[PDB]
Amino acid sequence: ICQRACKYAIRENIEKDIEKEKRRSENPEAMEEDGVDEVSEIKAAHFEESMKYARRSVSDADIRKYQAFAQTLQQSRGFGSEFRFE
Amino acid sequence: ICQRACKYAIRENIEKDIEKEKRRSENPEAMEEDGVDEVSEIKAAHFEESMKYARRSVSDADIRKYQAFAQTLQQSRGFGSEFRFE
């Protein structure tokens, strides 16, 4: 999820760069003013786009098998509190 | 489909050539006039003849298996639009 979120923010960054290059091609002689470059961050929209491709490799059936094994191991009952010395 | 269409146009071309050879055998001494040779192209009739032997190797069941795998991979739902920060 993090990889894909960074990846979508990354596409956003490169698209902004490509638009900047297009603008410079439009006005190559236009001196680049000291415009504060927008901070290239990882925003929530790209987290949304990443989770749109979120996966869950493990199903509840696999966890059911795991807890079945855990139960076959546990088998603990009876003397939890019924034991005390005279 | 393209191979068979070209192939049938190709049979047409060779049949025309064979008929020309037969005519020349009939009149070997007949000087070959400057008759514009018919343009040996790939026409729609031979595309019809080729598609008459068109195949589809993949059935809808194979694509159903592929999309079943794609669904087992996708498993994406729930938080497409239900998530937003305060």
> DSSP secondary structure string, A3-43?
HHHHHHHHHHHHHHHHHHHHHHHHSTTS------PPP----
Q: How far is CA B44 from CA B4, B16, B37, in A?
A: 12, 17, 20
* Residue A5 burial (CB count, 10 A): 20
CA distance B72 to B74: 6
Entry resolution in angstroms? 3.9
Residues of A in contact with B76 (CB under 8 A): 51-55
Distance CA B84, CA B82 (A): 7
Which two tokens mark B56?
């589809």
Dist. CA B8–CA B46, nearest whole Å: 5
Specify the residue for token string 């070959």: B32
Q: How far apart are CA A3 and CA A9, in angstroms?
A: 10
Query: Could you tell me the two tokens for A74?
Result: 């546990």
Residues of B whose CB is below 8 A from A5:
none
Inter-chain contact A53–B73, Cβ cutoff 8 Å?
no
Within 10 Å of residue A66's Cβ, how many Cβ atoms?
A: 11
User: How close, in Å, is residue A47 to chain B by CA atoms?
Assistant: 10
DSSP string computed for B2-62: HHHHHHHHHHHHHHHHHHHHHHHHHSTTS------PPP----HHHHHHHHTT----S-HHH
Name which of A1, A50, A51 to mutate to probe chain B: the one with the most chain B Cβ atoms within 10 A of its Cβ: A51
Measured between alpha carbons, how far is B83 from B43 in angstroms, rounded to an integer? Answer: 58
User: Which experimental technique did the depositors report for determining this structure?
Assistant: cryo-EM
Which residues have C-beta within 8 Å of that of residue B32, sequence separation ≥ 6?
Answer: B24
Q: What is the number of CB-based contacts under 8 A between chain A and chain B?
A: 18
